Design a protein around this nucleic acid. Structure first.
Ligand SMILES: [Mg+2]
Ligand SMILES: [Zn+2]
Ligand SMILES: [Zn+2]
Ligand SMILES: [Zn+2]
Lengths: 65, 773, 264, 180, 196, 160, 43, 114, 86, 133
RNA sequence: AUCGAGAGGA
């Protein structure tokens, strides 16, 4: 529902790279393959952690309580 | 049917099952939660008082423990709540409900229970996880996968009850089953894939890996075998390191389709004294085959040694495969560009054949085959034409597969997969069928609204030219789904009908038991069979042997079996016997050999009357092929020194041996003729191989070895006799009902509908047929 | 230099060390990367007490994420195992206590990074407890998100452990590992359709070795003694000290066997 | 779809209509809806009995004229030998249900396997709704870190599977290893 | 389960050291057997793994839609552009030893599903628990601490085994055993037995 | 049909023979026809062989039809199991089906008969016909919860 | 949830078989196994 | 639920020693050493070093079950050679190899930049 | 009906002990061994009541008899000394 | 404990029968007729091409466990560069005074033709096969 | 305790 802290397969930390990834896509007008490599995610085990992540928490905050 | 013939029971358990290659065959992994729950009432003796007092002190919350203590008053001391669970003093005669512990006899069950081998006793091994662990070579008699299946566990509550599990229902005792007279267990699916790759001629093992593999065999003797390659580098072959799990005194001979003794394709199997010679080990050797390794070891060494044999083969091969590796990708489904072009050429030339027959049938130039319509001749020819293309293009792919192709290696080892799986994945899945025919015109005169009316083409009627790799078209996808639905209906229908068939078989034969007069009777005392199986032999100790008097020319039968002492060209050579020159011309002994040769003539005429086709291989009680190799090894026999067997020794010895093969013991002319009839086929096998010329020339037995063969044959025969009390009717019904449950599928009714016709006797059969000669 | 295994650092950074291991047996190089993943210690959170949680996440959800936060472990050897210390539950000799409070004051979304963690216990002057921050914006790992009116108040006690007990105590992410890039030892059988040379790509370590002669016979008596590693650290322990404490914890495991033999 | 003469048979729907449909989609100017395709007679509702009288095309490339070196890896389509088209399929993949539209490459699978997964998709675990914390359900089962799949069907967009997924892109090795 | 009818349970759990590994240090989250592949002909399982591997490596999405022109050769041309083997094979190393595997492993991402069937919802063991009222038999259901059914299909197997005493024990001692008094003239249970 | 036949030399050799297979059956008027072998005629309708050629000829025809059911699906059951089934369907003089009107109409125990099918109707008739149950049946002892005459229970154990 | 809201039932001459006329209206694959196979359908 | 505590992979229980030495049956000058609370990290390294000493005839290790962190080591030596001394020299040779490995890394690390 | 015994001579049943009467004999002994009956073999460090009976049977120290019933009500008594265990 | 057979052969055929390390060899004997050789040889260790001449020897010795070779103390019985070890399993009388012997070197097989060796080459577990350059 | 549906396993 929110960004995993580390990659499952190897354990590389990915929890700090989420807002940098969303800014790399929008502010810098990049594609996902170059934004993933920019954040130091070369191994595809780490790459699917960010590329396939669904931020369901942003819709959980929409509920008022 | 719900509270008397079956009922819910205490001391039962259920959970998900999984596989453990480091468990034994008759072992079962039991979760510690279950082991803490289930109890066994153990009465205190001087031989358990010190152990049982500690288990009570351990308590019911951690294992090994106990839950209740029963005194002479009969009131249970609840060890969870009692204030005196610390100062117990176990007087003799009290009961302690201890936990289930290691090597306890428990019953393991997988439902549907269509087998005595679906409910057989295991040994408890308490494991630290939540699933029932079991060895992989016990999955086949349960039909148990590990994709979410569940199994049950029942715990005996008395010493009389545990005896029946350990001595009758134990797992090693059920390895060689009376159903199909062959072993039901075997090496499966990782050991099987590994034992092929291990046993190639190209597979050599270095010293470091050999010593780990060697120490992995539990009952290893410490003797490092001498490597098959010495000078450039010490290498061991995979045949070498595998033979350490096979016990000494195991002989296995099998020839597979090209098998010279030089064996260039590395096929066949020769095993000499527990060391294999030139065979690649695969499913024919190490599966649940008739006359395989498991069949030999269970009969020669015994059930306990064969149960150890499963784990030792597994612990060596699963070790080697863990450090070798094995995979499967989409690259194992791809054939060459030239191969795929020739495959689509093969489909196109068969589609042109359907077009020509369709143009032929359109001009009414077709000649209708006898007893069928013009349309039926058309449909028969097109289905044959499209099945020829699917099978030929599939064989075009299977020939193109290399030895490294992992689908082929599973096919070659026999672990998983067939030719048709290769064909449908790589070349062409082919013609789909509903109700035996092609896809019907569900719409008016067409199969789909994307076709014009009256289209009998392969595309229209449901021929799938593409493979699963190439991808099905939307029309091909729907016709495949339409046929695939029919299999799902057939699977659900056949499972429900066979379960009723198996229950009906059991409930009719539930009272058929072999009594002490060898008569097969029921509760009323009515004779069903006067002798069980007409010969009185338990099907477990029965295997296929060739009666080699049946075949061959009349000269070759004469050349191999006739001894003429009164002739010099057709007499026993002095090379074969110490009496070679003394015995020539003896009149009082040629009358014995003429008597023996007359029985071999009489038996050969008798066997051709029974087996009209001339089949020699038939299931018979005592395997004489193995006893001869046992004699050639125990008494070390050279084929140069002459024997010390008299003519009188062999002839009068065999006739005395036939007098001792007893199945019935009544001293009157009816029972003695019942006995003489019951052993006729075996004595036909006895005289054919214990004949004078065959012993002295082919076996070259000594008198010591010959008397030993006579002792084994008499011994193994008496073991193969049925035991009175054998509920053979329930065994008969389950031995038919279970392979009926695996029946799943040229105008005859076969399989489950035909079996439903036979059992529910059909006054209106679906297909009556008359065969006229 | 010294007689034995030779090391050649090809590339070195704060986060990666690519080196070559020469004159080593295969078992030692393998047991080096095994102990680097598993058995060298690290400080990470092993107890979370949640005072108030009004977030959209469960407490155990956040507690599991807190354990995965890379804390400083440079001077972890001056900290004791809590199972070894003589305290009641935990103390300053064996544990590091962290505090996290956050309130959704803003109308926009309030983010909870690991920079918001506050160390409470006395550190006694050792490099320990500090959450690792490699983000260029200075924030930590994004732990939670708050709406306006949501708060989260908890306390985290960080203890000492190895990755055998839980993978949060792993200082290393991925150990690259390759020997014999030309398969001159024939330790694997290449799967192929037409040509094994074209269907398999060249390794980067192929440039660091001599290609074999196709006419030369098989060098059968040869063995593996040159290995190519690249160790990467999460940040809890620096990269050089991942492998040095990897070596040191490995030889400490062997030395315990000598002490075990001397006692028997 | 609707085919008519234009004579030469042609789809009634043209690219100018697709541009107006996608202009309405991006604007999220006299919005061009589904009913605008229906009321302008470019799309018809056919049931099982009326499709007995029609000849459907499978794709708008079946209305292309005819004239060799084809890619041998592609599947084998047949030239239809039919030209009196009255309709065309919207997309062949629209014969599938909701659960079968999650299956990746179901045209490369045998037919009972697609049936099994369509039954096991209802047993897969994920976020069933975003308000699960507000509902009081007899049983509820939510995945910690759901992932949108790396291989997707184009029918997943309307089924909201990339927004409420039910599994994780696990790194899978197909291998025999220790026999467990 | 995966999305292709490939269901299975966890048989063992290994850590990253014990797990096999490629030269990049990538480790599988999951190992399945190659023997679940060929009998079931779930080729799309293996095309999914090849397509998901290229999409993860490139940051694009995998068009696994039905009825397309997405070919295994087209995906493998893209994977080979990424410096991997075209059919997805990868040289993997044994984690126990560090020695290479002789075979190369089919290796990549594949969308797997966690099904509703977990073990601790299925565990049951009774050992003389609560009984029913009418039949005085064990109750039905693991939620009620019931007993597993020794059905007549199981009675068949104990008869074929010849185990009369186990068959009697399941029917009586582990279940509704009972004592009654009957008359010697009429064989009915109509005797008043004042016991003390 | 290809067929193995004894050669005058003694070997078995392939002597093919023309064979007629029909689409219907009533054997009574078929074997009494010139040009055929009336000693080799065969029917899949074993019920006709029972009433034309006798019960034992029907018995072998019954086994042969079951054998083809097993062997066509590649399987193999031993002779004694199938033959025990066939003999039970035969030993009453004619074909007795494995059916509720079949084996379950025999003179066996009433509790044994009531355990299969038509449960209460069997016990109803047995209450009227005053049937005596021998309690030698396995199902009679399963109902009674006693050690049935099965294996371990097929005898008695006494002192020396 | 979406599959349950588009589920059909046939309460009971080969009804369970996939018919040609089922093209495009009902799913070819999505049906239960075993009991009530082919009767329960999904749009 | 049934799963054991994770520290049992490395934490010796009550009454458990690290090593247990038992003489081999039907094997002269051979011994079976049960290593408790260890895995392939130690066993593969000890066994490979026992192969380098040319007075050791046999060296092999095996984990009888992955559930339990323990293994067995079998050593067979020459006549007049205690396998414990072969184990001792192998263990000590491991430490001196790792000692030089640690020193040569720290030399090459300080030579580097970044 | 009344005393349908068979003499010790003219016994027609099998002299070999069946697997079904071996399991009952070993179970009957292990039952009474568990309830502290005297043991007629020098137990060589054997505690399991079944292995006592298996050792008691291999030395033929079990004073039991097998009354093998025939379908006409006749019966043959066989001592465990007489029977052969193979 | 000494030599059982000695001859010099010339290889006629080399056969990689779907293998990568093992070829089945077909060698004709010089110095004698009625003597041919068929043998499975590890070509990865000792390569054998066609038209080569290979001195082939069989010894009885030079049970107990295999000790690893302590380099210089253990005196070899082989001035050869390829040594195998196997077991005889079948003896084939081709003609009157014509014989054939079958050996199995762990699955690598041997066929030897000749007529005179009826004293030597017993059906023994002992068989060392030695091949010179 | 009775019916009803969903599912697991073949
Ligand atoms: Mg299963
Ligand atoms: Zn990663
Ligand atoms: Zn402390
Ligand atoms: Zn009365």
């Amino acid at each position: 529902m929110i960004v995993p802290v580390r990659c499952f397969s190897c354990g590389k930390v990915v929890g700090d790279k989420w807002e940098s990834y969303l800014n790399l896509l929008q502010e810098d007008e990049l594609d996902e393959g170059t934004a993933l490599s920019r954040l130091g995610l070369k191994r595809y085990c780490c790459r699917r952690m960010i590329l396939t992540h669904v931020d369901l928490i942003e819709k959980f905050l929409r509920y008022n309580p | 049917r719900g509270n008397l013939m079956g009922k819910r029971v205490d001391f039962s358990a259920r959970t998900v099952i999984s596989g453990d290659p480091n468990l034994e065959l008759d072992q079962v992994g039991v979760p510690k939660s279950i082991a803490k729950t289930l109890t066994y009432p153990e009465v205190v003796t001087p031989y358990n008082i010190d152990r049982l007092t500690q288990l009570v002190r351990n308590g019911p919350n951690e294992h090994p423990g106990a839950k209740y203590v029963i005194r002479d008053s009969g009131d249970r001391i609840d060890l969870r709540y009692s204030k005196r669970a610390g100062d117990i003093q176990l007087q003799y005669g009290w009961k302690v409900e201890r936990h289930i512990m290691d090597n306890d006899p428990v019953l393991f069950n997988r439902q549907p229970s269509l087998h005595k081998m679906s409910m057989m006793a295991h040994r408890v091994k308490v494991i630290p996880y939540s699933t029932f662990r079991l060895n992989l070579s016990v999955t086949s008699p349960y039909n148990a996968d590990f994709d979410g299946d569940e199994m049950n566990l029942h715990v005996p509550q008395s010493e009389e009850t545990r005896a029946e599990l350990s001595q009758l229902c134990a797992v090693p005792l059920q390895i060689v089953s009376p159903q199909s007279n062959k072993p039901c267990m075997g090496i499966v699916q990782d050991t099987l894939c590994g034992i092929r790759k291990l046993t190639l001629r190209d597979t050599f093992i270095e010293l470091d890996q050999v010593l780990n593999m060697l120490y992995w065999v539990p009952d290893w003797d410490g003797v490092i075998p001498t490597p098959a390659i010495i000078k450039p580098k010490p290498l061991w072959s995979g045949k070498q390191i595998l033979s350490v799990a096979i016990p000494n005194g195991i002989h296995l001979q099998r020839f597979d389709e090209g098998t010279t003794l030089l064996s260039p394709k590395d096929n066949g199997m020769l095993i000499i004294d527990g060391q294999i010679i030139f065979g690649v080990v695969e499913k024919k050797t190490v599966g649940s085959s008739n006359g395989g390794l498991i069949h030999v070891v269970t009969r020669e060494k015994g059930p306990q040694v064969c149960a150890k044999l499963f784990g030792n083969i597994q612990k060596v091969v699963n070790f080697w495969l863990l450090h070798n590796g094995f995979s499967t990708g989409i690259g194992d489904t791809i054939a060459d560009g030239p191969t795929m072009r020739e495959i689509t050429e093969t489909i196109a030339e068969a589609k042109k054949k359907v077009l020509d027959v369709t143009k032929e049938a359109q001009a009414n130039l077709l000649t209708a085959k006898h007893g069928m319509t013009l349309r039926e001749s058309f449909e028969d020819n097109v289905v044959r034409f499209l099945n020829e293309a699917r099978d030929k293009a599939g064989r075009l792919a299977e020939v193109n597969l290399k030895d490294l192709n992992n689908v082929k290696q599973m096919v070659m080892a026999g672990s998983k997969g067939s030719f048709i799986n290769i064909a449908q994945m790589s070349a062409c899945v082919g013609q789909q069928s509903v109700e035996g025919k092609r896809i019907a015109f569900g719409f008016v005169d067409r199969t789909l609204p994307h076709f014009s009316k009256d289209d009998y083409s392969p595309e229209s009627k449901g021929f799938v030219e593409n493979s699963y790799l190439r991808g099905l078209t939307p029309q091909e996808f729907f016709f495949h789904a339409m046929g695939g639905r029919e299999g799902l209906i057939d699977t659900a229908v056949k499972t429900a009908e066979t379960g009723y068939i198996q229950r009906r078989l059991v409930k009719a034969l539930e009272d058929i038991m072999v009594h002490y007069d060898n008569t097969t009777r029921n509760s009323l005392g009515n004779v069903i069979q006067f002798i069980y199986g007409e010969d009185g032999m338990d099907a477990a100790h029965i295997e296929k042997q060739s009666l080699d008097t049946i075949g061959g020319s009349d000269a070759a039968f004469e050349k191999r079996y006739r001894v003429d002492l009164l002739n010099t060209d057709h007499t026993l050579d002095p090379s074969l016997l110490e009496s070679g020159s003394e015995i020539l011309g003896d009149l009082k002994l040629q009358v014995l050999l003429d008597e023996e040769y007359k029985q071999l003539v009489k038996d050969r005429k008798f066997l051709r009357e029974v087996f009209v086709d001339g089949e020699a291989n038939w299931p018979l009680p005592v395997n004489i092929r193995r006893i001869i190799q046992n004699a050639q090894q125990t008494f070390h026999i050279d084929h140069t020194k002459p024997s010390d067997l008299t003519i009188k020794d062999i002839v009068l010895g065999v006739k005395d041996l036939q007098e001792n093969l007893l199945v019935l013991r009544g001293k009157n002319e009816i029972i003695q003729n019942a006995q003489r009839d019951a052993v006729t086929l075996f004595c036909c096998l006895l005289r054919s191989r214990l004949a004078t010329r065959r012993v002295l020339q082919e076996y070259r037995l000594t008198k010591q070895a010959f008397d030993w063969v006579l002792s084994n044959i008499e011994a193994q025969f008496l073991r193969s006799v049925v035991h009175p009390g054998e509920m053979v009717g329930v065994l008969a019904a389950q031995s038919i009902g279970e392979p009926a449950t695996q029946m799943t599928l040229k105008k005859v009714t076969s399989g489950v509908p035909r079996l439903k016709e036979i059992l529910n006797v059909a006054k209106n059969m679906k297909t009556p047929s008359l065969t006229v000669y | 230099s010294e007689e034995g295994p030779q090391v050649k650092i090809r590339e070195a950074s704060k986060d990666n060390v690519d080196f070559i291991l020469s004159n080593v047996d295969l078992a030692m190089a393998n047991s080096l990367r095994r102990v680097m993943i598993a058995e060298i210690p690290t400080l990470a959170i092993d107890s979370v007490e949640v005072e108030t949680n009004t977030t959209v996440l469960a407490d155990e959800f956040i507690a599991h994420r807190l354990g995965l936060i890379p804390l400083q472990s440079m001077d972890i050897e001056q900290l004791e195992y809590s199972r070894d210390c003589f305290c009641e539950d935990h103390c300053d000799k064996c544990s590091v206590v962290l505090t996290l409070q956050a309130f959704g004051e803003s109308e926009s979304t309030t983010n909870v990074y690991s920079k918001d963690l506050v160390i409470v216990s006395n550190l006694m002057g050792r490099n320990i407890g500090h959450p690792i921050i490699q983000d260029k914006e200075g924030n930590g790992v994004l732990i939670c998100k708050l709406r306006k009116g949501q708060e989260l108040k908890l306390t985290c006690v960080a203890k000492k452990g190895i990755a055998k007990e839980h993978a949060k105590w792993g200082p290393a992410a991925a150990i690259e590992f390759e020997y014999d890039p030309w398969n001159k030892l024939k330790h694997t059988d290449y799967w192929y359709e037409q040509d094994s040379a074209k269907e398999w790509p060249q390794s980067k370590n192929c440039e660091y070795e001599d290609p074999p002669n196709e006419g030369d016979p098989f060098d059968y008596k040869a063995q593996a003694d040159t290995f190519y590693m690249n160790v990467e650290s999460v940040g809890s322990i620096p990269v050089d000290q991942v492998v040095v404490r990897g070596i040191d914890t490995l030889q400490k495991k062997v030395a315990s066997i000598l002490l075990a033999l001397t006692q028997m | 779809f609707i085919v008519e003469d234009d004579g030469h048979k042609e789809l009634k729907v043209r690219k100018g209509h697709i541009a107006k449909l996608m202009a309405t989609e991006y604007q999220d100017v006299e919005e061009y809806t589904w009913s605008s395709l229906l009321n302008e007679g470019l799309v018809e509702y056919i049931d099982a009995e009326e499709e007995e009288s029609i000849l459907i095309a499978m794709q708008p490339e079946d209305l292309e004229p005819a004239e060799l070196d084809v890619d041998p890896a592609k599947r084998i389509r047949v030239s239809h030998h039919a030209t009196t088209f009255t309709h065309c399929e919207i997309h062949p993949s629209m014969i599938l249900g909701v659960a079968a539209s999650i299956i990746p490459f179901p045209d490369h699978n045998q037919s009972p396997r697609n049936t099994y997964q369509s039954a096991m998709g209802k047993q897969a675990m994920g976020v069933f709704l975003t308000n699960y914390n507000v509902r009081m359900d007899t049983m509820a089962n939510i995945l910690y870190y759901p992932q949108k799949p790396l291989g997707t069907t184009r029918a997943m967009e309307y089924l909201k599977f990339r927004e409420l997924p039910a599994g994780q892109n696990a790194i899978v090795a197909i291998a025999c290893y220790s026999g467990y | 389960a995966s999305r292709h009818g490939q269901k299975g349970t966890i048989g063992i759990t290994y850590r990253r050291e014990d797990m096999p590994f490629t030269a990049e240090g990538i480790v599988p989250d999951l190992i399945i057997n190659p023997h679940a592949i060929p009998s079931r002909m779930t080729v799309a399982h293996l095309i999914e793994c090849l397509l998901s591997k290229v999409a993860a490596l490139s940051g694009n999405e995998g068009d696994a839609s039905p009825f397309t022109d997405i070919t295994v050769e087209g995906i493998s041309k893209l994977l080979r552009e990424h410096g991997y083997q075209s059919r997805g094979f990868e040289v993997m190393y044994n984690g126990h030893t560090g020695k290479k595997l002789m075979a190369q492993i089919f290796f990549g991402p594949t969308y797997y599903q966690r099904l509703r069937h977990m073990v601790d919802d299925k565990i049951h063991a009774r050992a003389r628990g609560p009984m029913q009222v009418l039949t005085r038999q064990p109750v039905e259901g693991r939620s009620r601490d019931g007993g597993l059914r020794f059905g007549e299909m199981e009675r068949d197997c104990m008869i074929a085994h010849g185990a009369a005493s186990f068959l009697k024990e399941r029917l009586m001692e582990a279940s509704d055993a009972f004592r009654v008094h009957i008359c010697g003239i009429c064989g009915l249970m109509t005797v008043i037995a004042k016991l003390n | 049909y290809d067929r193995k036949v004894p050669s005058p030399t003694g070997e078995y050799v392939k002597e093919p023979e023309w064979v007629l297979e029909t689409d219907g059956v009533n054997l009574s008027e078929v074997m009494t026809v010139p040009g055929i072998d009336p000693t080799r005629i065969y029917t899949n309708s074993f019920i006709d062989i029972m009433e034309v050629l006798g019960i034992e000829a029907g018995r072998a025809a019954l086994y042969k039809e079951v054998y083809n059911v097993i062997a066509s699906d590649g399987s193999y059951v031993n002779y004694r199991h199938m033959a025990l089934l066939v003999d039970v369907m035969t030993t009453q003089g004619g074909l007795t089906s494995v059916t509720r009107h079949g084996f379950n109409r025999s003179n066996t125990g009433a509790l044994m008969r009531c355990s299969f099918e038509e449960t209460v109707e069997i016990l109803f008739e047995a209450g009227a016909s005053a049937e005596l149950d021998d309690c030698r049946g396995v199902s009679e002892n399963v109902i009674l919860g006693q050690m049935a005459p099965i294996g371990t229970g097929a005898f008695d154990v006494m002192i020396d | 949830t979406l599959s349950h809201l588009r589920r059909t039932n046939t309460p009971i001459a080969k009804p369970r078989q996939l018919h040609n006329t089922h093209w495009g209206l009902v799913c070819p694959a999505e049906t239960p196994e075993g009991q009530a196979c082919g009767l329960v359908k999904n749009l | 639920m049934n799963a054991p505590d994770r520290f049992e992979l490395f934490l010796l229980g009550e009454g458990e020693s690290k090593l247990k030495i038992d003489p081999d049956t039907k094997a002269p000058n051979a011994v079976v050493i049960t290593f408790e609370k260890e895995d392939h990290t130690l066993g593969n390294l000890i066994r490979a070093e026992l192969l380098n000493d040319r007075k050791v005839l046999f060296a092999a290790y095996k984990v009888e079950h992955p559930f339990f962190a323990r293994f067995k080591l079998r050593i067979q030596t020459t006549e007049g050679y205690d396998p414990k001394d072969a184990l001792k020299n192998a263990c000590n040779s491991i430490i001196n190899k790792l000692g030089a490995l640690k020193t040569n890394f720290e030399t090459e690390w300080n030579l580097q930049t970044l | 009906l009344k005393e349908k015994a068979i003499p010790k001579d003219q016994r027609a049943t099998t002299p070999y002990m069946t697997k079904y009467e071996r399991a009952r004999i070993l179970g009957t002994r292990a039952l009474q061994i568990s309830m502290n009956a005297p043991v007629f073999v020098d137990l060589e460090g054997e505690t399991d009541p079944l292995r006592i009976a298996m050792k008691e049977l291999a030395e033929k120290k079990i004073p039991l008899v097998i009354r093998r019933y025939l379908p006409d009500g006749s019966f043959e008594d066989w001592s465990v000394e007489e029977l052969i265990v193979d | 404990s000494n030599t059982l057979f000695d001859d010099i052969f010339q290889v006629s055929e080399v056969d990689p029968g779907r293998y990568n390390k093992v070829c089945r060899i077909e060698a004709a004997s010089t110095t004698q007729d009625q003597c041919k050789l068929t043998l499975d040889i590890n070509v990865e260790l000792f390569p054998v091409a066609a038209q080569d001449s290979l001195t082939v020897t069989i010894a009885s010795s030079l049970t107990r466990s295999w000790r690893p070779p302590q380099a210089g103390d253990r005196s070899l019985a082989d001035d050869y560069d390829y040594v195998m070890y196997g077991t005889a399993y079948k003896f084939e009388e081709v003609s009157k005074d014509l014989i054939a012997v079958y050996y199995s070197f762990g699955g690598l097989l041997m066929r030897l033709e000749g007529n005179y060796r009826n004293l030597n080459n017993l059906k023994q577990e002992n068989a060392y096969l030695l091949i010179r350059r």
